[PDB]
Amino acid sequence: SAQKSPAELKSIFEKYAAKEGDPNQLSKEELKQLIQAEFPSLLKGPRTLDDLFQELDKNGDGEVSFEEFQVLVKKISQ
Protein backbone atom coordinates (compact mmCIF):
# COMPACT_ATOMS: atom_id res chain seq x y z
CA SER A 1 0.00 0.00 0.00
CA ALA A 2 1.44 3.49 0.78
CA GLN A 3 3.69 1.39 3.02
CA LYS A 4 4.58 -1.98 1.47
CA SER A 5 3.69 -5.16 3.37
CA PRO A 6 6.10 -8.15 3.48
CA ALA A 7 3.45 -10.45 1.91
CA GLU A 8 2.81 -7.83 -0.77
CA LEU A 9 6.52 -7.47 -1.62
CA LYS A 10 6.91 -11.25 -1.47
CA SER A 11 4.01 -11.74 -3.93
CA ILE A 12 5.36 -9.07 -6.32
CA PHE A 13 8.91 -10.48 -5.95
CA GLU A 14 7.67 -14.01 -6.78
CA LYS A 15 5.76 -12.55 -9.76
CA TYR A 16 9.01 -10.93 -10.99
CA ALA A 17 11.43 -13.79 -10.21
CA ALA A 18 9.07 -16.27 -11.92
CA LYS A 19 9.80 -14.41 -15.22
CA GLU A 20 13.31 -15.96 -15.11
CA GLY A 21 14.23 -19.68 -14.97
CA ASP A 22 14.58 -19.73 -11.16
CA PRO A 23 11.56 -18.29 -9.19
CA ASN A 24 13.97 -17.29 -6.35
CA GLN A 25 15.82 -14.11 -7.53
CA LEU A 26 15.43 -11.09 -9.72
CA SER A 27 18.10 -10.18 -12.28
CA LYS A 28 19.31 -6.55 -12.57
CA GLU A 29 16.62 -5.74 -15.16
CA GLU A 30 13.87 -7.20 -12.94
CA LEU A 31 15.19 -5.55 -9.73
CA LYS A 32 15.41 -2.19 -11.54
CA GLN A 33 11.79 -2.59 -12.65
CA LEU A 34 10.81 -3.51 -9.07
CA ILE A 35 12.50 -0.35 -7.81
CA GLN A 36 10.65 1.66 -10.45
CA ALA A 37 7.35 0.06 -9.36
CA GLU A 38 7.80 0.55 -5.57
CA PHE A 39 9.41 4.03 -5.70
CA PRO A 40 10.65 5.50 -9.05
CA SER A 41 13.87 7.10 -7.73
CA LEU A 42 11.86 9.47 -5.44
CA LEU A 43 14.44 8.56 -2.75
CA LYS A 44 14.57 12.04 -1.17
CA GLY A 45 17.11 10.89 1.47
CA PRO A 46 18.29 7.26 0.97
CA ARG A 47 19.39 8.18 -2.60
CA THR A 48 20.85 4.68 -3.21
CA LEU A 49 19.20 3.20 -6.29
CA ASP A 50 22.24 0.94 -7.01
CA ASP A 51 24.50 0.76 -3.91
CA LEU A 52 21.84 -1.57 -2.37
CA PHE A 53 21.78 -3.65 -5.56
CA GLN A 54 25.55 -4.09 -5.50
CA GLU A 55 25.58 -4.92 -1.76
CA LEU A 56 23.12 -7.75 -2.68
CA ASP A 57 24.31 -8.51 -6.29
CA LYS A 58 24.38 -12.32 -6.19
CA ASN A 59 24.01 -14.26 -9.49
CA GLY A 60 22.39 -17.71 -9.30
CA ASP A 61 20.06 -17.49 -12.32
CA GLY A 62 19.08 -13.80 -12.18
CA GLU A 63 20.68 -11.51 -9.59
CA VAL A 64 19.37 -10.69 -6.13
CA SER A 65 17.94 -13.74 -4.32
CA PHE A 66 14.91 -13.69 -1.98
CA GLU A 67 17.47 -14.34 0.79
CA GLU A 68 19.44 -11.15 0.01
CA PHE A 69 16.38 -9.18 -1.27
CA GLN A 70 14.91 -9.18 2.27
CA VAL A 71 17.60 -6.56 3.13
CA LEU A 72 16.25 -4.44 0.23
CA VAL A 73 12.63 -5.05 1.33
CA LYS A 74 13.42 -3.67 4.82
CA LYS A 75 14.17 -0.24 3.23
CA ILE A 76 11.14 -0.15 0.86
CA SER A 77 8.65 0.92 3.54
CA GLN A 78 9.72 4.06 5.45
Domain containing 11: what range? 1-78
Alpha carbon distance 43, 14 (integer Å): 24
| Contacts for 58 with CB less than 8 Å, ≥ 6 apart | 25, 64, 65, 67, 68
CA atoms within 13 A on the CB side of 60: 14
We report the CATH number of the domain holding residue 44 as 1.10.238.10
Alpha carbon distance 31, 16 (integer Å): 8
- Residues annotated as binding site? 25, 30, 57, 59, 61, 63, 68
- Residues annotated as binding site for Ca(2+)? 25, 30, 57, 59, 61, 63, 68
Alpha carbon distance 13, 31 (integer Å): 9
Q: How many domains does the chain have?
A: 1
Q: Which residues pair with 25 in a beta bridge?
A: 65
Cβ neighbourhood burial of 30 (10 Å; 0-12, 13-18, 19+): buried
Q: Is the dihedral of CA 64, 52, 34, 14 positive or negative?
A: positive
| Contacts for 69 with CB less than 8 Å, ≥ 6 apart | 13, 25, 26, 56
